[PDB]
Amino acid sequence: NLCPAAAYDSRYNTKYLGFFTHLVQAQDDWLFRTTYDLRTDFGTSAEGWRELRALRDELKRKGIELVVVYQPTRGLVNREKLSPAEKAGFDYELAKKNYLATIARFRQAGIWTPDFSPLFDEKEEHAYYFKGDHHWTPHGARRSAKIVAETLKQVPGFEEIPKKQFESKRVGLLSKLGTFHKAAAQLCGNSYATQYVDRFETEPVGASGDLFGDGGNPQIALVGTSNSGPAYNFAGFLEEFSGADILNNAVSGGGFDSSLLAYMTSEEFHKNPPKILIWEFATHYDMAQKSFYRQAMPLVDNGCSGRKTVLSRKVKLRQGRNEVLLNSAALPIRSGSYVADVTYSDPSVHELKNTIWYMNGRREQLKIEQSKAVDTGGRYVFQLRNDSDWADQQFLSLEIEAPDMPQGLEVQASICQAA
């Protein structure tokens, strides 16, 4: 039913289109993406695995256990919706093997990791995935949350977490015209039916003993993508099957990084850290991205908050370059053991362009893009570079390139010792 042009990866050469490379027509109105859905490669580089373990450890030091929800591919779960040709062409066993190996590597990094493989190659009346979209249906989210809940119960400390009874009810229908279907419409002029599935919500029921473990506060937090959003009720099913409150901090559009970064920038996170942090994302993200970890690591301990700065200053941004902090007294500030903490006056500024000068004339240009949908109060936090040959350098200056900058916009920067 798809037009011939749809079969060529080079036809998907744009921003919108690159998320669909390339579309194939399966049974009924099922579409699959070859590179996203029918992939056989999973995981990350050795550096990625080291960064994941380091982050897990930092979290563990703070009394936080990490659970990763590694959402499986549409190909692994809904294999059977493929055409016989496509099914024959999709190396399902290789994909499954590589996926499971990746799950094992998560575990080896000290991360609790639910195994979704019993859901693979499913035969279910309510399909795990939408026909022409990248989101799971609520039923998919539900079957996933049952397994995750089983992992949560194994997590050290889970027994002390306050327990409640939750019930999930269907409260309406959820309409979705899938993104793959829309992409195919743009490419081929095709037209696909909007899907309507069961929409669910979850509520506490019963009496208001076990409710008061850990003083009664919620102890489990969820960070994630649009998949953990309210429409699919992933958090609600987690509560239903686990008996525990789930603080949902998912960010739609946030991808791999945004939700967790915004959450760990929040004050409540550092005031009352969760015993358990659940982290949900899919298989196409680059898990080794260094600028992610440079923020996440120092964010575990609230950057410079509560702790004395060696330098601190507030300047109004001019168009272009702004020198923000200058070590004019030539104080001892070793890079690979120092941290930056920075706050815009306008919380709607979702981009930060930094230049870091050292006493040897070298420079680092660090550019941090933040999701449009989050609000960290305009705050950003990052470690000074500690690559092989940078950790040793003496800090000289921090400069900030102005953002469509709001008028009057100022910025507050501070540099502190790291623990």
Sequence spans of domains, the chain? 1-302, 303-419
Residues 6+ apart with CB under 8 A from 215: none
Side-chain-side CA neighbours of residue 375 (13 Å)? 3
Report how far apart, in Å, the C-alpha atoms of 395 and of each of 82, 151, 343 are. 57, 45, 20
Q: Per the omega criterion (within 30 degrees of 0), is the bond before 22 cis?
A: yes
Find tokens 């969760």 and name the residue: 274
Report how far apart, in Å, the C-alpha atoms of 316 and of each of 56, 269, 327, 401 are. 38, 29, 19, 12
Q: 356: buried, middle or exposed (CB in 10 Å: 19+, 13-18, 0-12)?
A: buried
- Pick left, alpha or beta for residue 7 (phi over 0 → left; psi -120 to 50 → alpha; otherwise beta): alpha
What phi and psi values does residue 294 have, to the nearest 5 degrees? -60, -25
User: What method was applied to determine this entry?
Assistant: X-ray
Residues 6+ apart with CB under 8 A from 104: none
Is residue 232 helix, strand or coil? coil
Work out the number of other CB atoms within 10 angstroms of the CB of residue 410.
Answer: 15
Measured on CA atoms in the order 102, 107, 112, 114, is the torsion positive or negative? positive
Beta-strand (E) ranges in 242-288?
A: 246-248, 276-281
Q: What is the Cα–Cα distance from 334 to 311, expressed in whole angstroms? A: 13
**3-state DSSP helix/strand/coil % of the chain, to nearest 5:** 30, 25, 40
Resolution for this model in angstroms, one decimal place?
Answer: 2.1
Tokens of 353: 């362009």
Closest CA to 281 of 234, 244, 218: 234
Closest CA to 134 of 78, 188, 189: 78
- The amino acid occupying position 321 is R
Tokens of 33: 């993406």
Q: What is the Cα–Cα distance from 86 to 79, expressed in whole angstroms? A: 9
Is residue 267 helix, strand or coil? helix
Measured on CA atoms in the order 202, 208, 212, 215, is the torsion positive or negative? positive
**Catalytic residue positions?**
133, 135, 226
After which residues, if any, is the chain broken (C to N > 2.5 Å)? 208, 403
* Cα-based angle 306, 308, 309 (whole degrees, multiple of 5): 120
Superfamily of domain 303-419: C-terminal carbohydrate-binding module (2.60.120.1380)
DSSP H or E segment with residue 330: none
The pairing of beta strand 410-417 with beta strand 338-344: antiparallel
Q: What is the Cα–Cα distance from 13 to 266, expressed in whole angstroms? A: 38
Residue pair 5/188 in contact (Cβ under 8 Å)? The answer is: yes
Find tokens 């859905």 and name the residue: 37
Side-chain-side CA neighbours of residue 330 (13 Å)? 2
DSSP state, 337? G
Tokens of 165: 């009874």
Closest CA to 412 of 382, 385, 378: 378
